[PDB]
Design a binder for these strands. Structure first.
Lengths: 286, 286
DNA sequence: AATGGGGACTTTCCA
DNA sequence: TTTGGAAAGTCCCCA
């Protein structure tokens, strides 16, 4: 029931299999103690990873353990630089938690037979420990630098009347925990449309640099003063937009009744801070 | 009989004055215990700081104490996050040193009357200490973050006849110790020229920020799919170049027979990769 | 080697 | 609050 976490195991034994139904997104920013927990690991499908034990037949709920293991060139072992974090049951957290030790923190949720021996891991975050605080403590040789990829490790301990314990362990896909690269400045050099009717609706191509899938295009309007009086996002064709070409659908101007052209601006923004200098566009009366 | 480093001494007593004859540069990048030594503190001229004791008539060399202290606020005390560092008495280093402790290293060098009691400090470097190593001590110290300004601190103890030793202390100007961003992203806020004839030759003034003498300007043109079809460096009037104003000679266009306006771009570049936001310029026919 | 200069990586703070 | 989004601190490399 407390088998060493460094001891190797298998995901399947006889008719018993421990499987990860829903995997986690390949990216999760681990949080530090000096900052507010950054939530629980999520699934690529905007949900949560799912784990399930199949061949179980008894009616007594087992205990699923969760911990963070390595993801390097060596066989999986618990990660010394990250620790699972009990994403304190808020509103999304449904699966009851429970923390244990063993020099490695490990959670433990239950695998109820009524829940077909499958659980929704929505109560497990990833805390990042400080290298300096770890390295060379309790006998070490491992180093944290560049060791920022991990795996969610799961395991169950099935008891058999024959006095036998079946221990299954399943590791998730590698997860990247370091903060992702920051947004560069999107730059707009050319544009294939300078104006169109108030209805908007046409496609515009922005020739530039540093465009991405997260690139956004905002259309605004200034008063002679500087008071921005209009903001409208323009739909980007992610299916066509490239790093140096951004396809954008010109929005419908805020007022179709104008009888005189009206100058406006629009910028490309990466993330929520990296915008390009305002650009020019004109809307014509119908 | 040995004075504490956090005592309120002064640079002058009566006929006695401890003086910083040559202040150190206002900047010096400190080295970490993990990097090899980054060198001795220097004077804005390439030479080194100089300290002198003035009204001393005896003929017994004294010992000038050297240590690193706080720069800004309150009373001067040793800096918990910085330490003086003895530069190996190499052929170049002309002054003899000797180091000791008191939770904060102190370097001592000879102050000899054969030299008018004036020492050239060319044997002192600055060691940065990890913020977490310091802030962790039970002692209620300060905060390392953004606390990168230090000050060279010299001390002398003059033994008199009565058996009373006079103690003098002098602090240098503040020294910034953080690494020097060496190049910042140039920014063009304004321009006094939008048009020009394909012959170019005219002068364009760019108001902005982060402009340096090294700054460059390039004119470019490209297809809507990014192919560059024209690239020309405009000549900057190095001389009249301010840090937020560049004088550029608009270059001649590739085709001098245009009968219609040709839209192009140009940008400012600092270094090999920190270029500005692309700018819009038009070229006129005739 | 010592040298710095520059830049990638880690940790902390902030809009 | 959230938490992306830097900003400051520490460690590594040698066009």
């Amino acid at each position: 029931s407390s088998v060493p976490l460094e001891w190797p195991l298998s995901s399947q034994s006889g008719s018993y299999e421990l499987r990860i139904e829903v995997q986690p997104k390949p990216h999760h920013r681990a949080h530090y103690e000096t900052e507010g927990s950054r939530g629980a690991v999520k699934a690529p499908t905007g949900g949560h990873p799912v784990v399930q034990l199949h061949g179980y037949m008894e009616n007594k709920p087992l205990g699923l353990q969760i911990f963070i293991g390595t993801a390097d060139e060596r066989i999986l072992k618990p990660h010394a630089f990250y620790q699972v974090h009990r994403i304190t049951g808020k509103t999304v957290t449904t699966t009851s938690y429970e923390k244990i030790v063993g020099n490695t923190k490990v959670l433990e949720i239950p695998l109820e037979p009524k829940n077909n021996m499958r659980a929704t891991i929505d109560c497990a975050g990833i805390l990042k420990l400080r290298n300096a605080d770890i390295e060379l403590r309790k006998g070490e040789t491992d180093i944290g630098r560049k060791n920022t990829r991990v795996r969610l490790v799961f395991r169950v301990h099935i008891p058999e009347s024959s006095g036998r314990i079946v221990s299954l362990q399943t590791a998730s896909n590698p997860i990247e925990c370091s903060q992702r690269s920051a947004h560069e400045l999107p730059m707009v050099e050319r544009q294939d449309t300078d104006s169109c009717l108030v209805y908007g609706g046409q496609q515009m191509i922005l020739t530039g640099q540093n465009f991405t899938s997260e690139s956004k295009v905002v259309f605004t309007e200034k008063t002679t003063d500087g008071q921005q009086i209009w903001e409208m996002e323009a739909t980007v064709d992610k299916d066509k937009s490239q790093p140096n070409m951004l396809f954008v659908e010109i929005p419908e101007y805020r007022n179709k009744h104008i009888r005189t052209p009206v100058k406006v601006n629009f910028y490309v923004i990466n993330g929520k801070r990296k915008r390009s200098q305002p650009q020019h566009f004109t809307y014509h009366p119908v």
